[PDB]
């Protein structure tokens, strides 16, 4: 029943966990608790096999642990700044080489998989700070420049015409802008990691920078110069939709250093670089 299917989504009971059955004392030469970790397989022993359990009807569900749920929350991926200090023409526009590597929180989550395929929902939170008092009428333009398209070099560059590129215009006082993007790779999935180069010489680049070119995000204050200077900070949020992930991996254990690389720093006292807390000894809980 596609309606029975719907009731489960509303209650979040699509993926139920198994019940615990009653077990009894045993005496046999079948020893489930014994095994060999050398095989590379996890012992599949359950509680009913080691202790005498009662019958319990499980109600827990795994819905929230699904990949869709784990990566399906908007997180910040960039904070764009347009600060008018002394030259409107030079300070009223900027650009950003798109990527999901600059903010640790969402980067770590996606990097718990080797490959991932998903659509994206971008939400923008612009905030205009009045440095001199008034803010006037702020209108912003965010333009997606795919690799190859002309990048604007002045606030009146012809590229802002956006004859083919996608642009979103936002007016101060209106709701936060938002839009969807389909899976963009030229491959079947995005590479969270890439053990490869863009050539075979000592000067070839290594890593995801080779495969994850997403283009540039160009933005500008559409409004022309005003008497009072403002500082506009636009925060970009990303969320994955219709997600699929492959080959899970160990979580990032040390701070990130740069984008597109697994490089890290290490101090003289390494225990400070990882989340592991020193134990007094083996028996001090």
């Amino acid at each position: 029943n596609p309606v029975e299917r719907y009731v489960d989504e509303v209650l979040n009971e699509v993926l139920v966990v198994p019940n615990i059955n009653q077990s009894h004392p045993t005496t046999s030469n079948a020893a489930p608790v014994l095994d060999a970790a050398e095989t590379g397989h996890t012992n599949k022993i359950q509680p009913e096999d080691t202790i005498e359990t009662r019958y319990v009807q499980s109600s827990q569900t795994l819905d929230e642990m699904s990949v869709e749920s784990f990566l399906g929350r908007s997180g910040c991926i960039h904070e764009s700044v347009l600060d008018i200090v002394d030259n409107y023409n030079d300070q009223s526009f900027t650009k950003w080489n798109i990527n999901l590597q600059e903010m640790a929180q969402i980067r770590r989550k996606f990097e718990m998989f080797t490959y991932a395929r998903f659509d994206s929902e971008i939400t923008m939170v612009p905030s205009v700070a009045a440095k001199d008092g008034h803010i006037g009428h702020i209108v912003m333009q965010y333009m997606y420049v795919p690799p190859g398209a002309p990048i604007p070099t002045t606030r009146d560059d012809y590229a802002w015409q956006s004859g083919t590129n996608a642009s979103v215009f936002w007016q101060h006082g209106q709701p936060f802008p938002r839009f969807s993007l389909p899976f963009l790779s030229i491959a079947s999935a995005y590479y969270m990691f890439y053990d490869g180069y863009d050539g075979d010489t000592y000067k070839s680049r290594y890593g995801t920078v080779v495969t994850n070119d997403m283009g540039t995000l160009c933005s500008r204050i559409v409004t022309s110069e005003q008497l009072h200077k403002v500082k506009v900070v636009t925060r970009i949020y990303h969320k994955a939709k219709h997600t699929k992930a492959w080959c899970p991996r160990p979580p990032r254990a040390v701070q990130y250093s740069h984008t597109h690389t697994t490089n890290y720093k290490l101090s003289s006292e390494v225990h400070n670089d990882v989340a592991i807390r020193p134990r007094t000894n083996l028996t001090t809980v």
């Binding site: 299917r5 719907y6 749920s69 969807s180």
Partner: peptide
């Protein structure tokens, strides 16, 4: 366009835009 189901409790599952990327979170399982 949207998928209407009946049993009576109808599940009007609307898709307001013409692209698949536009819809919300996917169903599980």
């Amino acid at each position: 366009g949207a998928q209407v189901s009946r049993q009576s409790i109808n599940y009007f599952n609307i898709n307001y835009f013409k692209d698949a990327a536009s819809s919300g979170a996917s169903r599980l399982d």
